[PDB]
Amino acid sequence: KNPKSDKFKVKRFHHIEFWCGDATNVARRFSWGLGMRFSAKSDLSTGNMVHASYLLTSGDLRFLFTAPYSPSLSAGEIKPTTTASIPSFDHGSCRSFFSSHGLGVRAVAIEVEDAESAFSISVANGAIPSSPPIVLNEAVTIAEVKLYGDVVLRYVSYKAEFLPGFERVEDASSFPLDYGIRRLDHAVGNVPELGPALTYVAGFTGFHQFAEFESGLNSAVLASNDEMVLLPINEPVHGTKRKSQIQTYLEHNEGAGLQHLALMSEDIFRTLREMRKRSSIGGFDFMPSPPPTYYQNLKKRVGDVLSDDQIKECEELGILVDRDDQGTLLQIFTKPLGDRPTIFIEIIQRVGCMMYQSGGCGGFGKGNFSELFKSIEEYE
Amino acid sequence: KNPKSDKFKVKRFHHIEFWCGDATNVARRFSWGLGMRFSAKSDLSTGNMVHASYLLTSGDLRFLFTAPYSPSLSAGEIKPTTTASIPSFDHGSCRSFFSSHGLGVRAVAIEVEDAESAFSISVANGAIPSSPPIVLNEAVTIAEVKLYGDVVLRYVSYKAEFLPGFERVEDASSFPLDYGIRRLDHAVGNVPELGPALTYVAGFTGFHQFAEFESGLNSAVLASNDEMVLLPINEPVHGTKRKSQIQTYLEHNEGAGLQHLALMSEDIFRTLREMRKRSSIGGFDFMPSPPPTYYQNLKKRVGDVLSDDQIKECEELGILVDRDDQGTLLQIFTKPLGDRPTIFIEIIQRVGCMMYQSGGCGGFGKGNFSELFKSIEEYE
Ligand SMILES: Cc1c(C(=O)c2c[nH]n(C)c2=O)ccc(S(C)(=O)=O)c1C1=NOCC1
Ligand SMILES: Cc1c(C(=O)c2c[nH]n(C)c2=O)ccc(S(C)(=O)=O)c1C1=NOCC1
Ligand SMILES: [Co+2]
Ligand SMILES: [Co+2]
């Protein structure tokens, strides 16, 4: 059941913004590790004396890496005279975010029809304002409200090229990498209490709970009208044998924040081959693969969807598999993206639910908690 | 003339430590960009609740990348109970360094016979103490004094594997990259006033001025007894037509600091081929090459040292060439390593002065300032 109760018109995920201490180095690492090309910049070379921002793109996926310059470069400016291309940016906020959380996501940005309306309606419905709507070069409106922890939900809308003041990256600098990643599927937050977090976010968006079908967590998924914007939220379960990974997140992150980003690949096998090639030469590592018993147990579960070959390929790459009552999903998880055991990345591909493919086809892998535990009872 | 006036026994450059906001991402980028393997770690997985430190090595070159964790992970510790592997580390100092300077070098570390003696004698001779000598697992002594800005000169000495508490990196994680870089040749500081900086550093080390042979700078090189430890220092020249790049450094860095690191390659041609292959896929960019007139002018200057082929190869790669009265050097410069126009890297290879090769053979490229200007008068 989907009540389609969005309080304003939402389109798709637009971009994810990381707040960094050095944007160059994080961006170059991510570019090579994920096969995303350098697409636009806003920095000293573009007249921006406030922050360095570098945009990586793969298909529709947009990753933005931003870091502050010395405040002294812009000490003469005021907000009316600012050279920043992202007017919500604040040196103190950025430095405090990075020093508190380490590398992580500051903004989950969605495109909307009218960012000013989305902000006003959100705030009228309990959203805590973070940055008021601002119109950029009479073309793009941007506004921000608090999502959880120090993460904001950013509304972007276009009257009619990333943002004004960003320049296209020179053809010599932008190598056309591509490992098959195409768009953001979902963005997951970790909080201490799921109930109040859900109430808040569902409160100001009108997003509805996405239906699904004891490992230390409870969760729930909020979804937009066409369920293409998917925002799961986790809370820890205390008192379990194995200490809750959600609680470990909260301790090392210094509170709530974005836990993982799920990136849809048009070919998860090519994506994982390409990423695994680069794990030890500057890219990303992957969590330990499941035991071969897990892959022997796949024939009974998805033998009508994956051939023995495609199952074998899953085993080569460590890919996990789950199934809805509607569809099937292939997924796998990176190790944390930075120093702390906090944010990681999920690679996903969904099979089924053709109408275009409907959102969340196959679910989010909830069944893989039990199937992993069961399969990892292969000590005999 | 070399008075060999070191006030304590100095061996060689031991390592360079960068202070980062996320050590993982900087280290992975540098590893791929420079062909340096992951050699040791000290982090959560090794019991270090204070800082993440990752060591990259190429030949004798050691690059250390360190970032702080949340202070809360170690809030119960005191210095006697610390889990940090680098006892000089301080959360507040590291965060203040990175927020003030952005990504850059915190420590120039040299190996000495006796780090406790080197510290005591240095401080008796005007050095500003930064971290007192501390003995690690009864095996290694480490001590730090101020060098310039927020950069320290670190003394390391071994009674008899990087530092205690560091673990070797698993054979699966450490890919054996190597683009030919073998050791640190020199480390250059930028200061507002050369005179007082030289007086200070020469004051507490006994390092002597290295002999050499209007583009906006003055400089001088301090050297150890065998002139294998080489510490040049620059100051800006104000009032020139083209604004002093040294002054631009000081403004964007918020004061004095390490300007460039010069890394010796055993084969600069292979090194530059390998690095240039990776410039646009996560590695380092290089400054704009000189005009072909520069390379036509090379036959008269080094035609007795480089063949037409090796000169042509220089032209392919943008390599610059200078000559002492003793030797010849090949050099080239990266664009800044991070967001700010501050620290960059020099790749160098020296030809001549065989006895082993004596330090600074060929100089530092001072003649290339005039030769670049002259050659870049090719507008007709
Ligand atoms: C995060 C995760 C998902 C996941 O993406 C979602 C679950 N719920 N929602 C809304 C999600 O997006 C699915 C399976 C597993 S797993 C390895 O157990 O098979 C895991 C992990 N557990 O810890 C490490 C990775
Ligand atoms: C830094 C530099 C050196 C250099 O390494 C040293 C000079 N003195 N000392 C002690 C040095 O180590 C040599 C030639 C040039 S250059 C491009 O002019 O030919 C440059 C640069 N100028 O600005 C950009 C790079
Ligand atoms: Co997920
Ligand atoms: Co140099």
CSV table of C-alpha atoms in Angstrom, one decimal, chain B residues 17-376:
chain,number,residue,atom,x,y,z
B,17,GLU,CA,54.6,12.7,7.9
B,18,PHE,CA,51.5,14.4,6.4
B,19,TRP,CA,48.7,15.5,8.8
B,20,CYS,CA,45.4,14.7,7.2
B,21,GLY,CA,41.7,14.8,7.9
B,22,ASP,CA,41.2,11.3,6.4
B,23,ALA,CA,44.5,9.4,6.2
B,24,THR,CA,43.0,6.5,4.2
B,25,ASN,CA,42.0,8.5,1.2
B,26,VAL,CA,45.1,10.6,0.9
B,27,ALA,CA,47.3,7.5,1.3
B,28,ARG,CA,45.4,5.5,-1.3
B,29,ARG,CA,45.6,8.5,-3.8
B,30,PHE,CA,49.4,9.0,-3.1
B,31,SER,CA,50.0,5.2,-3.4
B,32,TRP,CA,48.5,5.0,-6.9
B,33,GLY,CA,49.8,8.4,-8.1
B,34,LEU,CA,53.4,7.8,-7.0
B,35,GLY,CA,53.7,4.0,-7.1
B,36,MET,CA,54.3,3.5,-3.4
B,37,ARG,CA,53.2,0.4,-1.6
B,38,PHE,CA,51.3,0.2,1.6
B,39,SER,CA,53.9,-1.0,4.1
B,40,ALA,CA,52.7,-0.6,7.7
B,41,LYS,CA,49.7,0.6,9.7
B,42,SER,CA,48.8,1.8,13.2
B,43,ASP,CA,45.1,2.2,13.6
B,44,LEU,CA,42.0,0.7,15.2
B,45,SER,CA,42.9,-2.7,13.9
B,46,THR,CA,46.2,-2.5,15.8
B,47,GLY,CA,44.8,-1.2,19.0
B,48,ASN,CA,45.4,2.5,18.3
B,49,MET,CA,42.3,4.4,19.6
B,50,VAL,CA,44.0,7.8,19.0
B,51,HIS,CA,45.1,8.2,15.4
B,52,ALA,CA,45.1,6.4,12.1
B,53,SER,CA,48.6,6.2,10.5
B,54,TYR,CA,49.4,4.6,7.2
B,55,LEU,CA,52.9,4.2,5.8
B,56,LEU,CA,53.8,4.2,2.1
B,57,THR,CA,57.2,3.2,0.9
B,58,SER,CA,59.1,3.3,-2.3
B,59,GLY,CA,62.8,2.3,-2.0
B,60,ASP,CA,64.0,4.2,1.0
B,61,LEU,CA,61.2,6.8,0.7
B,62,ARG,CA,58.7,6.7,3.5
B,63,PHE,CA,55.5,8.7,3.4
B,64,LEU,CA,53.3,8.6,6.6
B,65,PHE,CA,49.7,9.7,6.5
B,66,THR,CA,48.1,10.4,9.9
B,67,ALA,CA,44.6,11.6,10.9
B,68,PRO,CA,42.9,11.8,14.3
B,69,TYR,CA,39.9,9.6,15.4
B,70,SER,CA,37.2,11.0,17.6
B,71,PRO,CA,38.8,12.0,21.0
B,72,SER,CA,36.0,10.0,22.6
B,73,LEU,CA,37.6,6.7,21.6
B,74,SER,CA,40.5,7.5,23.9
B,75,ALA,CA,38.9,9.8,26.5
B,76,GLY,CA,39.8,7.4,29.2
B,77,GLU,CA,43.5,7.3,28.4
B,78,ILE,CA,46.3,9.4,29.8
B,79,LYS,CA,49.8,9.7,28.3
B,80,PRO,CA,51.1,6.8,30.5
B,81,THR,CA,48.2,4.6,29.3
B,82,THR,CA,48.1,5.9,25.7
B,83,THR,CA,47.3,3.6,22.7
B,84,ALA,CA,48.8,6.1,20.2
B,85,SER,CA,51.9,4.7,18.5
B,86,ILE,CA,53.3,8.2,17.9
B,87,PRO,CA,53.3,9.8,21.4
B,88,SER,CA,53.9,13.3,20.0
B,89,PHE,CA,50.4,13.1,18.4
B,90,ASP,CA,47.8,15.5,19.8
B,91,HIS,CA,44.2,15.7,18.6
B,92,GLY,CA,44.0,19.4,19.0
B,93,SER,CA,47.3,20.1,17.3
B,94,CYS,CA,46.4,17.9,14.4
B,95,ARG,CA,42.9,19.4,13.9
B,96,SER,CA,44.3,22.9,14.2
B,97,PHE,CA,47.1,22.1,11.7
B,98,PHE,CA,44.8,20.7,9.1
B,99,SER,CA,42.1,23.4,9.5
B,100,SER,CA,44.8,26.1,9.3
B,101,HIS,CA,47.0,24.8,6.5
B,102,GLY,CA,45.0,22.1,4.8
B,103,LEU,CA,46.8,18.9,3.7
B,104,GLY,CA,50.5,19.2,4.3
B,105,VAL,CA,53.7,18.0,6.0
B,106,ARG,CA,53.8,18.1,9.8
B,107,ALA,CA,57.1,16.3,10.3
B,108,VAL,CA,60.4,16.1,8.4
B,109,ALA,CA,62.0,13.2,10.2
B,110,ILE,CA,65.7,12.4,10.1
B,111,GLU,CA,67.4,9.4,11.6
B,112,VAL,CA,70.2,10.3,14.1
B,113,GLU,CA,72.5,8.2,16.3
B,114,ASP,CA,70.9,9.4,19.5
B,115,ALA,CA,67.5,11.2,19.4
B,116,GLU,CA,67.7,12.2,23.1
B,117,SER,CA,71.1,13.8,22.6
B,118,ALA,CA,70.0,15.4,19.3
B,119,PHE,CA,67.0,17.0,21.1
B,120,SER,CA,69.0,18.1,24.1
B,121,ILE,CA,71.8,19.6,22.1
B,122,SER,CA,69.3,21.2,19.7
B,123,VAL,CA,67.4,22.8,22.5
B,124,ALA,CA,70.6,23.9,24.2
B,125,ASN,CA,71.4,25.7,20.9
B,126,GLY,CA,68.1,27.6,20.4
B,127,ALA,CA,65.7,24.9,19.1
B,128,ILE,CA,62.1,25.4,20.3
B,129,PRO,CA,61.1,22.1,21.8
B,130,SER,CA,58.0,20.4,20.4
B,131,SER,CA,57.9,16.9,21.9
B,132,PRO,CA,60.4,15.6,24.4
B,133,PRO,CA,62.4,12.5,23.7
B,134,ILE,CA,60.3,9.3,24.3
B,135,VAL,CA,61.6,5.8,24.2
B,136,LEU,CA,59.3,3.3,22.4
B,137,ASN,CA,59.3,-0.3,23.5
B,138,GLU,CA,62.9,0.2,24.7
B,139,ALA,CA,63.9,0.2,21.0
B,140,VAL,CA,63.3,3.5,19.3
B,141,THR,CA,63.6,7.1,20.5
B,142,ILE,CA,61.6,9.9,19.0
B,143,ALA,CA,61.8,13.6,19.7
B,144,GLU,CA,60.7,16.8,17.9
B,145,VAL,CA,61.7,20.4,17.7
B,146,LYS,CA,60.1,23.3,15.7
B,147,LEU,CA,61.5,23.7,12.2
B,148,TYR,CA,59.3,26.5,10.7
B,149,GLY,CA,55.7,27.4,10.8
B,150,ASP,CA,53.9,24.4,12.3
B,151,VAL,CA,56.4,22.0,10.8
B,152,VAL,CA,58.7,20.0,13.1
B,153,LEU,CA,62.0,18.4,12.6
B,154,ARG,CA,61.6,14.9,14.0
B,155,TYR,CA,64.7,13.0,15.4
B,156,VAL,CA,64.4,9.2,15.3
B,157,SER,CA,67.1,6.8,16.5
B,158,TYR,CA,67.2,3.0,16.9
B,159,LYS,CA,69.2,1.0,19.4
B,160,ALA,CA,69.4,-1.9,17.0
B,161,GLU,CA,59.6,-2.4,12.1
B,162,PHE,CA,58.8,1.2,11.2
B,163,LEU,CA,58.0,2.1,14.8
B,164,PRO,CA,56.8,-0.1,17.6
B,165,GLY,CA,53.0,-0.6,17.5
B,166,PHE,CA,53.0,-0.5,13.7
B,167,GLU,CA,52.1,-3.7,12.0
B,168,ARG,CA,53.2,-5.0,8.6
B,169,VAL,CA,50.4,-4.7,6.0
B,170,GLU,CA,48.9,-7.9,4.8
B,171,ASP,CA,50.3,-9.3,1.6
B,172,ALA,CA,46.9,-9.1,0.0
B,173,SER,CA,46.4,-5.4,0.7
B,174,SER,CA,50.0,-4.3,-0.3
B,175,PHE,CA,50.3,-4.4,-4.1
B,176,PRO,CA,54.0,-4.0,-5.1
B,177,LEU,CA,53.7,-0.7,-7.0
B,178,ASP,CA,57.0,0.9,-8.0
B,179,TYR,CA,57.5,3.7,-10.6
B,180,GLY,CA,61.3,4.1,-9.7
B,181,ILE,CA,61.2,6.5,-6.8
B,182,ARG,CA,63.9,5.6,-4.3
B,183,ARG,CA,64.5,8.3,-1.7
B,184,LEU,CA,63.9,11.8,-0.5
B,185,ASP,CA,66.5,14.2,-2.0
B,186,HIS,CA,65.5,17.5,-0.3
B,187,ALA,CA,62.6,19.1,1.6
B,188,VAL,CA,61.9,22.8,1.0
B,189,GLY,CA,60.3,25.3,3.4
B,190,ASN,CA,58.7,28.7,2.6
B,191,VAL,CA,59.0,31.5,5.2
B,192,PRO,CA,58.3,35.2,5.2
B,193,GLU,CA,62.0,36.0,6.2
B,194,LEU,CA,64.9,33.8,5.0
B,195,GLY,CA,67.5,35.3,7.3
B,196,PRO,CA,66.0,34.6,10.7
B,197,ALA,CA,64.8,31.2,9.5
B,198,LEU,CA,68.3,30.2,8.4
B,199,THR,CA,69.9,31.6,11.6
B,200,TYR,CA,67.5,29.6,13.7
B,201,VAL,CA,67.8,26.2,11.9
B,202,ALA,CA,71.5,26.5,11.3
B,203,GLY,CA,71.8,27.6,14.9
B,204,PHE,CA,70.5,24.5,16.6
B,205,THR,CA,71.6,21.8,14.0
B,206,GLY,CA,75.1,23.0,12.9
B,207,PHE,CA,74.0,22.5,9.3
B,208,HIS,CA,76.1,24.5,6.9
B,209,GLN,CA,75.1,26.5,3.9
B,210,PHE,CA,75.3,24.4,0.7
B,211,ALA,CA,77.0,26.3,-2.1
B,212,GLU,CA,75.1,27.0,-5.3
B,213,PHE,CA,76.8,27.5,-8.8
B,214,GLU,CA,64.8,38.1,-10.3
B,215,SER,CA,61.9,35.7,-10.2
B,216,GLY,CA,60.4,36.6,-6.9
B,217,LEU,CA,62.3,34.6,-4.3
B,218,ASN,CA,65.6,34.3,-2.4
B,219,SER,CA,66.7,30.9,-1.0
B,220,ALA,CA,69.5,29.1,0.7
B,221,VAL,CA,70.2,25.4,1.4
B,222,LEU,CA,71.2,24.0,4.8
B,223,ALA,CA,73.0,20.6,4.7
B,224,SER,CA,74.3,18.0,7.1
B,225,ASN,CA,78.0,16.9,7.3
B,226,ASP,CA,77.8,14.5,4.3
B,227,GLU,CA,75.2,16.8,2.6
B,228,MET,CA,72.6,14.0,2.3
B,229,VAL,CA,70.2,15.8,4.5
B,230,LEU,CA,69.2,18.9,2.5
B,231,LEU,CA,66.8,21.6,3.8
B,232,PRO,CA,66.4,24.5,1.4
B,233,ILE,CA,64.3,27.5,2.6
B,234,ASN,CA,62.7,30.2,0.5
B,235,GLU,CA,61.5,33.8,1.1
B,236,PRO,CA,59.5,36.0,-1.2
B,237,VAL,CA,60.7,39.0,-3.1
B,238,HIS,CA,58.1,41.7,-2.9
B,239,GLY,CA,57.4,44.3,-5.5
B,240,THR,CA,58.1,42.2,-8.6
B,241,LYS,CA,55.9,42.2,-11.7
B,242,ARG,CA,54.7,38.6,-11.4
B,243,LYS,CA,53.5,38.3,-7.8
B,244,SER,CA,55.8,36.1,-5.8
B,245,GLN,CA,54.7,32.5,-5.8
B,246,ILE,CA,56.3,32.3,-2.3
B,247,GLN,CA,54.0,35.0,-1.1
B,248,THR,CA,51.0,33.2,-2.6
B,249,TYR,CA,52.1,30.1,-0.7
B,250,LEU,CA,52.2,32.1,2.6
B,251,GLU,CA,48.8,33.5,2.0
B,252,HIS,CA,47.0,30.3,1.1
B,253,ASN,CA,48.9,28.2,3.7
B,254,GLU,CA,48.3,30.7,6.5
B,255,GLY,CA,52.1,31.3,7.0
B,256,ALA,CA,55.3,29.3,6.8
B,257,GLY,CA,55.4,25.6,5.9
B,258,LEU,CA,56.8,22.9,3.7
B,259,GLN,CA,56.7,24.0,0.0
B,260,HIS,CA,58.0,21.0,-1.9
B,261,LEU,CA,59.4,17.5,-1.5
B,262,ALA,CA,62.0,16.4,-4.0
B,263,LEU,CA,62.0,12.6,-4.6
B,264,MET,CA,64.9,10.9,-6.3
B,265,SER,CA,64.1,8.5,-9.1
B,266,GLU,CA,66.6,5.8,-10.2
B,267,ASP,CA,64.9,6.3,-13.7
B,268,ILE,CA,63.1,9.6,-14.1
B,269,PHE,CA,61.9,8.6,-17.5
B,270,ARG,CA,60.1,5.5,-16.3
B,271,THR,CA,58.8,7.4,-13.3
B,272,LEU,CA,57.4,10.2,-15.4
B,273,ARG,CA,55.8,7.8,-17.9
B,274,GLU,CA,54.2,5.9,-15.1
B,275,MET,CA,53.0,9.0,-13.2
B,276,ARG,CA,51.8,10.8,-16.4
B,277,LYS,CA,49.7,7.7,-17.3
B,278,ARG,CA,47.8,8.2,-14.1
B,279,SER,CA,47.4,11.9,-13.9
B,280,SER,CA,43.8,11.9,-15.0
B,281,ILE,CA,42.9,8.6,-13.3
B,282,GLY,CA,43.5,9.6,-9.7
B,283,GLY,CA,47.2,10.4,-9.7
B,284,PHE,CA,49.2,13.7,-9.9
B,285,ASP,CA,49.2,16.4,-12.6
B,286,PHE,CA,52.4,18.1,-13.8
B,287,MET,CA,53.1,21.8,-14.3
B,288,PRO,CA,52.9,23.1,-17.9
B,289,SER,CA,55.9,21.9,-19.9
B,290,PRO,CA,58.5,24.4,-21.2
B,291,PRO,CA,58.3,25.4,-24.9
B,292,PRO,CA,60.2,23.4,-27.6
B,293,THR,CA,62.7,26.3,-27.7
B,294,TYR,CA,63.8,25.2,-24.2
B,295,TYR,CA,64.6,21.7,-25.6
B,296,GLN,CA,66.3,23.1,-28.7
B,297,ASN,CA,68.5,25.2,-26.3
B,298,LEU,CA,69.4,22.0,-24.4
B,299,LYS,CA,72.0,20.7,-27.0
B,300,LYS,CA,74.3,23.7,-26.3
B,301,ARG,CA,73.9,23.3,-22.5
B,302,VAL,CA,73.9,19.5,-21.9
B,303,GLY,CA,74.7,18.0,-25.3
B,304,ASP,CA,77.8,16.4,-23.8
B,305,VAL,CA,75.7,14.7,-21.1
B,306,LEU,CA,72.4,13.8,-22.8
B,307,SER,CA,72.1,12.3,-26.3
B,308,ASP,CA,69.6,13.6,-28.8
B,309,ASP,CA,67.4,10.7,-27.9
B,310,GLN,CA,67.5,11.3,-24.2
B,311,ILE,CA,66.9,15.0,-24.9
B,312,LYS,CA,63.9,14.1,-27.1
B,313,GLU,CA,62.6,11.9,-24.2
B,314,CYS,CA,62.9,14.9,-21.9
B,315,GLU,CA,60.7,16.8,-24.4
B,316,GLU,CA,58.1,14.1,-24.5
B,317,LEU,CA,57.8,14.2,-20.7
B,318,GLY,CA,58.3,17.9,-19.9
B,319,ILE,CA,61.4,17.2,-17.9
B,320,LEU,CA,63.7,20.2,-17.1
B,321,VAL,CA,67.5,20.0,-17.0
B,322,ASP,CA,70.1,22.0,-15.1
B,323,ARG,CA,73.9,21.6,-14.6
B,324,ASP,CA,76.3,22.3,-11.8
B,325,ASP,CA,80.0,22.8,-12.2
B,326,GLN,CA,80.1,19.2,-10.8
B,327,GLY,CA,77.0,17.5,-12.2
B,328,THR,CA,73.7,17.5,-14.1
B,329,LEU,CA,70.1,17.2,-12.8
B,330,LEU,CA,66.8,16.3,-14.4
B,331,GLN,CA,63.8,17.6,-12.6
B,332,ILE,CA,60.0,18.2,-13.0
B,333,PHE,CA,57.3,19.5,-10.8
B,334,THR,CA,53.7,18.4,-9.9
B,335,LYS,CA,50.8,20.7,-9.6
B,336,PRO,CA,49.9,21.2,-5.9
B,337,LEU,CA,49.1,17.9,-4.1
B,338,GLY,CA,45.8,19.1,-2.7
B,339,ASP,CA,43.2,21.9,-2.8
B,340,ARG,CA,45.5,24.8,-2.0
B,341,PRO,CA,48.4,26.2,-4.1
B,342,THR,CA,50.8,25.2,-1.5
B,343,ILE,CA,52.7,21.9,-1.3
B,344,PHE,CA,53.9,20.2,-4.5
B,345,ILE,CA,56.3,17.4,-5.4
B,346,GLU,CA,59.5,17.5,-7.4
B,347,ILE,CA,60.8,14.4,-9.2
B,348,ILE,CA,64.6,14.5,-9.6
B,349,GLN,CA,67.5,12.5,-11.0
B,350,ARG,CA,71.1,13.5,-10.6
B,351,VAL,CA,74.0,12.6,-13.0
B,352,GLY,CA,77.6,12.8,-11.9
B,353,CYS,CA,79.6,13.4,-8.7
B,354,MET,CA,80.6,9.7,-8.3
B,355,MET,CA,83.0,9.0,-5.6
B,356,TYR,CA,78.0,6.4,-4.2
B,357,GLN,CA,76.9,9.8,-5.4
B,358,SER,CA,77.6,12.9,-3.4
B,359,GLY,CA,74.7,15.0,-2.1
B,360,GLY,CA,73.1,17.7,-4.2
B,361,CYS,CA,75.1,16.7,-7.3
B,362,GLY,CA,74.0,19.3,-9.9
B,363,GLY,CA,72.4,21.7,-7.5
B,364,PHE,CA,68.7,22.4,-7.3
B,365,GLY,CA,67.8,23.9,-10.7
B,366,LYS,CA,68.5,27.6,-10.0
B,367,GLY,CA,69.6,28.2,-13.6
B,368,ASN,CA,66.2,26.9,-14.8
B,369,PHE,CA,64.6,30.2,-13.7
B,370,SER,CA,66.5,32.1,-16.3
B,371,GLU,CA,66.5,29.3,-18.9
B,372,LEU,CA,62.7,29.0,-18.6
B,373,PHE,CA,62.1,32.8,-19.0
B,374,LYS,CA,64.5,32.9,-21.9
B,375,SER,CA,63.1,29.9,-23.7
B,376,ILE,CA,59.5,31.1,-23.1
